[PDB]
């Protein structure tokens, strides 16, 4: 595995046939394995696209790897999903696992469906970043933090309080899977495409105010598109 060396203002592959001493490895603290947010590559953040990026496969056992400090994530995910028979789906995170240190909008999902596979797997092989351990598998509970890792040779309340958008799942692990945003014990908004967590946040203008606000024992499910809100379009 090659490492990028920072030298002469550029990255260079470490896997060369000469170890030129223009760079000195004075200590092990010049070593880096920093995580990077997958999102920083222009990768889509749609909740359905996230599903589209996971393999949903039974398979060779999961591994995680230790990695170095790195960038904040705007979007990450938490999962409660189970099989249609209520069986647990995806292993619970292993001891000492916690969600990534700085996702600003951790999305969360609940509900059930076939939830195919055992470890899911990232289709691009991108690592889930739980805390400081990169992963090949999706863990229940803790934040997914999709990302990639680079190895290189070196020469306030919102930091955890930020986090938005929780939703139900209808089915799981398939293209037919659907998700619905939930606020104020109301389930609405398929999250079909192009909706930032902030796009969804402004829709709390509807809570007990601009439309919505059922006068009945419970929620009616409006479709995301008043046109967006799909007020009174629940069925």
């Amino acid at each position, epitope marked *: 595995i090659p490492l990028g060396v920072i030298h002469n203002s550029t990255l260079q592959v470490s896997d060369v046939d000469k170890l030129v001493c223009r760079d000195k490895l004075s200590s092990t603290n010049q070593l880096r394995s920093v995580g990077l947010n997958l999102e920083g590559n222009g990768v889509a953040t749609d909740v359905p696209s996230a599903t589209k990026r996971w393999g949903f496969r039974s398979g060779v056992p999961p591994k995680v790897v230790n990695y170095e400090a790195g960038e904040w994530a705007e979007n990450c995910y938490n999962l409660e999903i189970k*099989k*249609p*028979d*209520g069986s647990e789906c995806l292993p619970a995170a292993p001891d000492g696992i916690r969600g990534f240190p700085r996702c600003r909008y951790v999305h969360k999902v*609940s*509900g*059930t469906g076939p939830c195919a596979g055992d470890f899911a797997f990232h289709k691009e092989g991108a690592f889930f970043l739980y805390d400081r351990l990169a992963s090949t598998v999706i863990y229940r509970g803790t934040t997914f933090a999709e990302g990639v890792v680079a190895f290189l040779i070196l020469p306030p309340s919102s930091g955890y309080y930020s986090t938005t958008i929780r939703y*139900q799942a*209808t*089915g799981f692990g398939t293209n037919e899977t*659907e998700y*619905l945003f939930e606020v104020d014990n109301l*389930t609405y908004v398929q999250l079909e495409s192009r909706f930032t967590p902030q796009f969804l946040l402004q829709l709390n203008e509807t809570i007990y105010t601009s439309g919505k606000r059922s*006068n*009945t*024992t*419970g*929620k*009616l*499910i409006w479709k995301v598109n008043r046109k967006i809100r799909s007020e*009174e379009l*629940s*069925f």
Partner: antibody
Amino acid sequence: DVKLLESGGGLVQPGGSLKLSCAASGFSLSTSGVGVGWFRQPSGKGLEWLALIWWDDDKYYNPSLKSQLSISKDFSRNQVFLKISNVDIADTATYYCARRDPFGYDNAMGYWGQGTSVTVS
Amino acid sequence: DIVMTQSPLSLSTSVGDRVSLTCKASQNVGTAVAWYQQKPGQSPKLLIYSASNRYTGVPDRFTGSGSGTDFTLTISNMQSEDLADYFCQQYSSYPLTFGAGTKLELR
């Protein structure tokens, strides 16, 4: 048009326990927001509420019976279940599994199962 | 929990009679109410939706009305086939409640 079906435990001693169930043979129940529930009519009595179940994983109970009542489901088979602790003769009744009929505005649930009944001895 | 009542508890009937039934709630239902029809050996079929619309497949003799705590069910041009137990329910809040019931007695 859904073939909602009824099933349940047989005759029980009073102070016993009973499990009841239903199923939607005519419908997957996979639409988000499906609501189903139960009510009973002892002795030709009006529609006493028993419980509500949502496909969105929401559960509700008639609080007077809630202390002895629990909701369970098996969606893979389109099944709904109720369990009742300490069943006794006061719980004998006509019962129905139910589903939203207009399905999505003002509840209206509305749609009925085949009907079942409970007795004790 | 919320009180529901209905009246008349029984009504004598004959063909062509305009049946009038009402449902009252302690709490302001706001039109989230429904009416039901029942006969022995049968489920209590839905009659009224959102305090006014007859349920589809309900005969057009049936009508309904009101808002707030007051609602009605009526039958224009009643037919003897319309004798039934009648009920209503509150969907504006829960635990769910239902009317005390009414019956019709043709004679």
